[PDB]
Amino acid sequence: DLVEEILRLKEERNAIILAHNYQLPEVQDIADFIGDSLELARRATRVDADVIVFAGVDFMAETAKILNPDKVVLIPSREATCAMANMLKVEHILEAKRKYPNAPVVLYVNSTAEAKAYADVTVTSANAVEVVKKLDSDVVIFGPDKNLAHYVAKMTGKKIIPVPSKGHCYVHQKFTLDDVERAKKLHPNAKLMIHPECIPEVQEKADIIASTGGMIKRACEWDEWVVFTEREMVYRLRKLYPQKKFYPAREDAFCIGMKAITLKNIYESLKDMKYKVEVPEEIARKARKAIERMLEM
Ligand SMILES: C=C(CC(=O)O)C(=O)O
Ligand code: SF4
Ligand SMILES: [Cl-]
Numbered sequence: 001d002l003v004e005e006i007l008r009l010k011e012e013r014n015a016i017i018l019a020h021n022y023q024l025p026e027v028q029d030i031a032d033f034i035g036d037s038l039e040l041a042r043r044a045t046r047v048d049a050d051v052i053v054f055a056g057v058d059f060m061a062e063t064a065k066i067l068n069p070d071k072v073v074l075i076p077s078r079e080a081t082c083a084m085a086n087m088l089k090v091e092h093i094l095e096a097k098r099k100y101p102n103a104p105v106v107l108y109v110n111s112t113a114e115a116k117a118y119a120d121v122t123v124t125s126a127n128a129v130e131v132v133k134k135l136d137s138d139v140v141i142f143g144p145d146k147n148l149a150h151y152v153a154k155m156t157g158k159k160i161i162p163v164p165s166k167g168h169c170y171v172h173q174k175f176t177l178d179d180v181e182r183a184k185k186l187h188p189n190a191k192l193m194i195h196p197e198c199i200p201e202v203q204e205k206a207d208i209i210a211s212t213g214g215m216i217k218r219a220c221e222w223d224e225w226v227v228f229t230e231r232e233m234v235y236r237l238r239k240l241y242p243q244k245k246f247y248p249a250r251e252d253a254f255c256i257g258m259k260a261i262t263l264k265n266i267y268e269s270l271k272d273m274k275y276k277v278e279v280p281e282e283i284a285r286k287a288r289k290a291i292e293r294m295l296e297m
């Protein structure tokens with residue numbers, strides 16, 4: 001029984017398991033805390049445990065390590081990676097800074113630690129609009145996600161310089177206007193919760209535009225929802241609100257990187273103390289400055 005083995009190893013290692021909302025149901029069921037990128041970042045600043053097992057993708061485990069440099073942070077598989085975050089390279093940031101030296105560099109937390117070393121502040125889908133609104137500039141450098149950048153431009157009225165030019169999430173790019181039409185036909189009493197990583201014409205059909213954390217916060221506003229994000233979010237919402245109804249917009253909206261994490265390799269992570277997540281001190285310090293500024297804003 002992997003679940004009983006994991007529970008005993010958690011105790012033996014003085015470990016906490018942090019899980020993203022897109023983790024497999026059986027992984028969510030053994031996590032101590034579950035949340036979106038911003039909540040996982042905040043939760044990483046009050047870790048009393050000695051070991052963090054991060055059931056999520058590599059940039060998320062790195063963010064936890066940046067905020068807990070003297071704790072052991074484990075990722076259960078090094079193949080748990082984010083295709084969108086990998087699209088942004090330091091070269092892109094440097095070129096944009098050359099053109100707009102007075103523009104703050106605003107990096108989605110969906111980014112490498114190397115990239116965050118060049119950020120003035122980080123953001124998530126939950127706080128991107130608030131942060132960019134308060135920055136002392138009418139133009140900001142922003143990436144990697146161009147669909148979130150479109151949403152931020154619309155809501156703040158500021159000029160958004162995307163880095164790179166085509167950054168996007170293949171999972172959320174799957175959603176189309178035909179999925180909106182089918183959801184409206186199959187569930188005519190449901191409202192639509194849509195992630196800002198979806199394309200702009202789908203965003204415009206939303207009843208609410210929100211990160212997964214915002215979806216959880218605003219689900220109380222209606223009793224039936226079609227969920228335009230990675231399909232494991234439906235399980236999360238059904239567990240939190242058993243009295244509501246939730247439907248996937250597309251069952252095939254799956255993140256391969258997220259599903260590199262399994263119950264078995266969480267067990268192996270605790271058993272073998274692997275895979276240890278490390279961030280170079282110079283990169284971590286600079287990234288930490290931008291992430292702390294995000295939490296302060
Ligand atoms: C990209 C994300 C993923 C999510 O919405 O859970 C974020 O900013 O929180
Ligand atoms: S769902 Fe998209 S943005 Fe999130 S980890 Fe997977 S590839 Fe990255
Ligand atoms: Cl409730």
Ligand SMILES: [N+]
Pocket residue numbers: 136
């Ligand atoms: N100013």
